[PDB]
Design a protein around this ligand. Structure first.
Ligand SMILES: CC(=O)O[C@H]1C(=O)[C@@]2(C)[C@H]([C@H](OC(=O)c3ccccc3)[C@]3(O)C[C@H](OC(=O)[C@H](O)[C@@H](NC(=O)c4ccccc4)c4ccccc4)C(C)=C1C3(C)C)[C@]1(OC(C)=O)CO[C@@H]1C[C@@H]2O
Ligand SMILES: Nc1nc2c(ncn2[C@@H]2O[C@H](COP(=O)(O)OP(=O)(O)OP(=O)(O)O)[C@@H](O)[C@H]2O)c(=O)[nH]1
Ligand SMILES: Nc1nc2c(ncn2[C@@H]2O[C@H](COP(=O)(O)OP(=O)(O)O)[C@@H](O)[C@H]2O)c(=O)[nH]1
Ligand SMILES: [Mg+2]
Lengths: 108, 412, 426
């Protein structure tokens, strides 16, 4: 699957570029990380479930009401949250942006 | 009137050690006399603590020295940005705080080594801030720049480019002296196989002593700091002269030492004694300040330059009809009593911006790319963050430098 | 900066006794002890290792983790022994279990939180935290397993701060454990992600070095442990000591590691002469350089000939010329252009420290990064599959409540980790 090279790059970074971190918070947030905090994310970030778990997302598992709207809210709408700037952030992230507007949009 | 120096980085500190140490000898202000010009700043506590424990303990005020328990890191990223920021507030407040008291500061001669995270990184912002704030002031930076082969740090070329890039607009004039380059002076000229870092710093000690100490000290020619940039630098970058000392002659072994003005001045030009790797292969000489202390007769000087001008291997750039700035200081160079130094009656220091550095920058520049393409260590940098970002964008900027340097010479 | 030591696993603990054995002396601490310290200086930095409860008492700040009561007890009952704070020991009577699986999941898991409690307490203690040290063996259930797990929580809790590792990578020729592929592979799997800096030591390599390099007829474990303790001390404590050019851990991390793997290094001590005759007094510089660089006297199994260096860091501690040290290296570099590796312009990171190992004049620790190690990794994995495919031992693990996939995953990760190394090599 996705090469590790991308993953560690973000993680090891003691303090990631802020919007990246914010993005990670967002993505983790899509994951629904309860914790604000880094560390809880951090150990989460490297975990055996993590590597696959992102890659395949069971639709049923994801829950519409809260989860749908925040993402839908225009976090994307955000003034620079969205695809283009984020895409600058990484090669890796880029395929993800497509994912955001994707099956999720189509089915729903 | 006065200038305040700041020493940063461990290395800048260790020079910081030297620069003051030489000073005290000259002035004759023993261990416990007046109060220092300058402050020292290091992210790594131990080294500064060396100052704290070590020689000239009382002389500095603890207010003067700035430190952090926190980690230096050998990388531009933390030192500049991340760890970086926290210290600066204290730093700047210090400089202003010091600045306030003095009357009519000419500017600060900041010392740093290219050279490391705190030397890079941390300093780069520091000068960065200065330009806005002080602005009117003249900002020279004294740098020690990576030995061509030698460089200790793995990371190093990453640091330097960013440092040079960032500071470049900011600094009025920056002096660069090469570590291994000096070594050759040691090896051949004094013949020390041994020499420690302390030795080199002593050497720089002497050279610096001319620029700040002696010049400000009244003397026949009297050169200002401001003149330094004005005469020295053709152009809005930033330009980095090299610094040379004729009298390097070994203390014990050989006593020609009465080498009158003609010979001593003559000594510098030869590529050997640059304290820079540069060894002007092609290099054109835009401009020089020669500052002499000792017994000099200006006729002796004036004649001396004239012959030099003519020999025409030297080949100055066309656009400068002439660019020789004589400076004469009454009082002879002062040699640190024991250790190495020759203690010549008269000495020459001469700085210049030469085309030659373009060679150095290119080499320096080359180092950067090799790692960079693989991208190397960068993950460390990005983590400190830093972004792809600064590296490449900076990379281009200094690339501009190479063009800039090249264009200046080689064409008429 | 402060550093906290970790001892996990018997090997684990055994080395820990030695490590502190030297270190205590290096600092000048007697068993309950205080700073008898010949010099003043040693006193100042000490804080990295120790906390100041008594004023007399500086007690090393580190934790002992071991299912085996016997191992720990001997250490307590042993010489230095008493020095440790009893709190430090985190123990579990439960069967040590050879199983990595036992250590990690089943047996280890319960203890770990208890373990973590203290780690934090030491962590919390004061000043700033450089990071943690680790010793253990890939080894066994306690050595790996728990220890490998322990780092995991450490990684999470304080990501910023650095972990260096010492692992006794399984000795090639005859493995001191039957299980050897299983425990080792999975354990390294954790580190490669987890610990930012790792050091490997190999026993036979120690034997080889001890036996040739030192006249020493009868290597004892206490010997190998002792020599090993030698390198790390140069690494950690030395730089805490002043130096004209002194790196610290982060310098070691930054300069040394090109890529995120954290990679693994092989320690190598500068002085290694017999008691005895060998005392040449050819320390000068170059003799040191020759020693470390040379193929043997490399702590880990692999030989640099094989063999290219991503990075080298030499922390010399002793008063030597900057001129010679820096200059000498270059010739080494030029001389061995083939292996060094072209891209990174100045391979060697040089650290100089003023003060030598308290007995001796001039020594450099040699640390760092080479492609060669990859050869080592193949060994473990190669054993791994031969074992794995047949699955001989496995039931113990799985009965313990381990996954089939887990085995496969661990191997491949380290396995391809080997693959990563080669890429640079070419
Ligand atoms: C009379 C004299 O000069 O004796 C020397 C000596 O003969 C030699 C042979 C020592 C000796 O070391 C060994 O024989 C040895 C035994 C087991 C494993 C490894 C080495 C020595 O035992 C070791 C001892 O080392 C130290 O004192 C260092 O500070 C060292 N200390 C320890 O390892 C240590 C040992 C016991 C208890 C506590 C600490 C050290 C090195 C690096 C970082 C920190 C500390 C020294 C110089 C000597 C003796 C005493 C004979 C040598 O080793 C070291 C590490 O210095 C072996 O080759 C070197 C060259 C030395 O000259
Ligand atoms: N002339 C001279 N050069 C020095 C001295 N100390 C260090 N250097 C050189 O400067 C560079 C070393 O920088 P470091 O000491 O690693 O780092 P630093 O710039 O102090 O800052 P950090 O990386 O954060 O520690 C190398 O190129 C050394 O050769 C010194 O006392 N004199
Ligand atoms: N250098 C060294 N290796 C050791 C020591 N003790 C055990 N080992 C090595 O560790 C491996 C065995 O693992 P072990 O430490 O018994 O595992 P655990 O105790 O169950 O965690 C073998 O490869 C041994 O050579 C020691 O004191 N020093
Ligand atoms: Mg430093």
């Amino acid at each position: 699957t996705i090469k590790k090279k991308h993953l560690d790059e973000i993680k090891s970074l003691p303090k990631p570029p802020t919007p990246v971190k914010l993005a990670m918070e967002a993505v983790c947030l899509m994951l629904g990380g309860k914790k604000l905090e880094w560390a809880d994310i951090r150990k989460k970030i490297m975990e055996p479930n993590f590597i696959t778990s992102i890659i395949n997302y069971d639709t049923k598992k994801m829950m519409t009401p809260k989860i749908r709207e925040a993402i839908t809210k225009g976090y994307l709408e955000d003034p620079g949250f969205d695809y283009e700037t984020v895409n600058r952030a990484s090669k890796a992230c880029g395929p993800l942006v497509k994912w955001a507007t994707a099956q999720t949009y189509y089915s729903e | 009137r006065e200038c305040i120096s700041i020493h940063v980085g461990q290395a800048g500190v260790q020079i910081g050690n030297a620069c003051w140490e030489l000073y005290c000898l000259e002035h004759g202000i023993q261990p416990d006399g007046h109060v220092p010009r300058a402050v020292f700043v290091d992210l790594e506590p131990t080294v500064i603590d060396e100052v704290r424990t070590g020689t000239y303990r009382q002389l500095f005020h603890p207010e003067q020295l700035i430190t952090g328990k926190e980690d230096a890191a050998n990388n531009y990223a933390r030192g500049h940005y991340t760890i970086g920021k926290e210290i600066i507030d204290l730093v700047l407040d210090r400089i202003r705080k010091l600045a306030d008291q003095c009357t009519g500061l000419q500017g600060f001669s900041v010392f740093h080594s290219f050279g490391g995270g705190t030397g890079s990184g941390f300093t780069s912002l520091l000068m960065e801030r200065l330009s806005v704030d002080y602005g009117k002031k003249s900002k020279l930076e004294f740098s020690i720049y990576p030995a061509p082969q030698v460089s200790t740090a793995v990371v190093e070329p990453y640091n330097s480019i960013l440092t040079t890039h960032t500071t470049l607009e900011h600094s009025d004039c920056a002096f660069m002296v090469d570590n291994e380059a000096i070594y050759d002076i040691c090896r051949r000229n004094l013949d020390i196989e041994r020499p420690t870092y302390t030795n080199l710093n002593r050497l720089i000690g002497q050279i610096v002593s001319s620029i700040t100490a002696s010049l400000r000290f009244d003397g026949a020619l009297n050169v200002d700091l401001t003149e330094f940039q004005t005469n020295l630098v053709p152009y809005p970058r930033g330009h980095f002269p090299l610094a040379t000392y004729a009298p390097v002659i070994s203390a014990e072994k050989a006593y020609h030492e009465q080498l009158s003005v003609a010979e001593i001045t003559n000594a510098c030009f030869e590529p050997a004694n640059q304290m820079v790797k540069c060894d002007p292969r092609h290099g054109k000489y835009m401009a020089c300040c020669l500052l002499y202390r000792g017994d000099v007769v200006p006729k002796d000087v004036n004649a001396a330059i004239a012959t030099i001008k003519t020999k025409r291997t030297i080949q100055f750039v066309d656009w400068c009809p002439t660019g020789f700035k004589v400076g004469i200081n009454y009082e002879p160079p002062t040699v640190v009593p024991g250790g190495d130094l020759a203690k010549v009656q008269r000495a020459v220091c001469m700085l210049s911006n030469t085309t030659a550095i373009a060679e150095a920058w290119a080499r320096l520049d080359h180092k950067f790319d090799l790692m960079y393409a693989k991208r190397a260590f960068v993950h460390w940098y990005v983590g400190e963050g830093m972004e792809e970002g600064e590296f490449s964008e900076a990379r281009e900027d200094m690339a501009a430098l190479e063009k800039d340097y090249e264009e200046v010479g080689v064409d008429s | 900066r402060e550093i906290v030591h970790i001892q996990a696993g018997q090997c684990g603990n055994q080395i820990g006794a030695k490590f502190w054995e030297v270190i205590s002396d290096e600092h000048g601490i007697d068993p309950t002890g205080s700073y008898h310290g010949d010099s003043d200086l040693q006193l100042e930095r000490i804080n990295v290792y120790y906390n100041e409860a008594a004023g007399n008492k500086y007690v090393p700040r580190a934790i002992l983790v071991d299912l085996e009561p016997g191992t720990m007890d001997s250490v307590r009952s042993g010489p230095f022994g008493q020095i440790f704070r009893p709190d430090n020991f985190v123990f579990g009577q439960s069967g040590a279990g050879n199983n990595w699986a036992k250590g990690h999941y089943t047996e280890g898991a319960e203890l770990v939180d208890s373990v973590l409690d203290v780690v934090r307490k030491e962590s919390e203690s004061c000043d700033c935290l450089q990071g943690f040290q680790l010793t253990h063996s890939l080894g066994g259930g306690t050595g790996s397993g728990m220890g490998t797990l322990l780092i995991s929580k450490i990684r999470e809790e304080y990501p910023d701060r650095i972990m260096n590792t010492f692992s006794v990578v399984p000795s090639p020729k005859v493995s001191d454990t039957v299980v050897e592929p299983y425990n080792a592979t999975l354990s390294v799997h954790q580190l490669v992600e987890n610990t930012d800096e790792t050091y490997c030591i190999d026993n036979e390599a120690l034997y080889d070095i001890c036996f040739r390099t030192l006249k020493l007829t009868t290597p004892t474990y206490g010997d190998l442990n002792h020599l090993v303790s030698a390198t790390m001390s140069g690494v950690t404590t030395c730089l805490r000591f002043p130096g004209q050019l002194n790196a610290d851990l982060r310098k070691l991390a930054v300069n040394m590691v090109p890529f995120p793997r954290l990679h693994f290094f092989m320690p190598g001590f500068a002085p290694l002469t017999s008691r005895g005759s060998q005392q040449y007094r050819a320390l000068t510089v170059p003799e040191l350089t020759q020693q470390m660089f040379d193929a043997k006297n490399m702590m880990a199994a692999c030989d640099p000939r094989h063999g290219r260096y991503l990075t080298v860091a030499a922390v010399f501690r002793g008063r030597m010329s900057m001129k010679e040290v820096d200059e000498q290296m270059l010739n080494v570099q030029n001389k061995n252009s083939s292996y060094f590796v072209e891209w990174i312009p100045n391979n060697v990171k040089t650290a100089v420290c003023d003060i030598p190992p308290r007995g001796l004049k001039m020594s450099a620790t040699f640390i760092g990064n080479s492609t060669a190690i990859q050869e080592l990794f193949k060994r473990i994995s190669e054993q791994f599959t031969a074992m794995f495919r047949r699955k001989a031992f496995l039931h113990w693990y799985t009965g313990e409540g381990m996954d089939e996939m887990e085995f496969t995953e661990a191997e491949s990760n380290m396995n391809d980790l080997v693959s990563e190394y080669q890429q640079y090599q070419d």
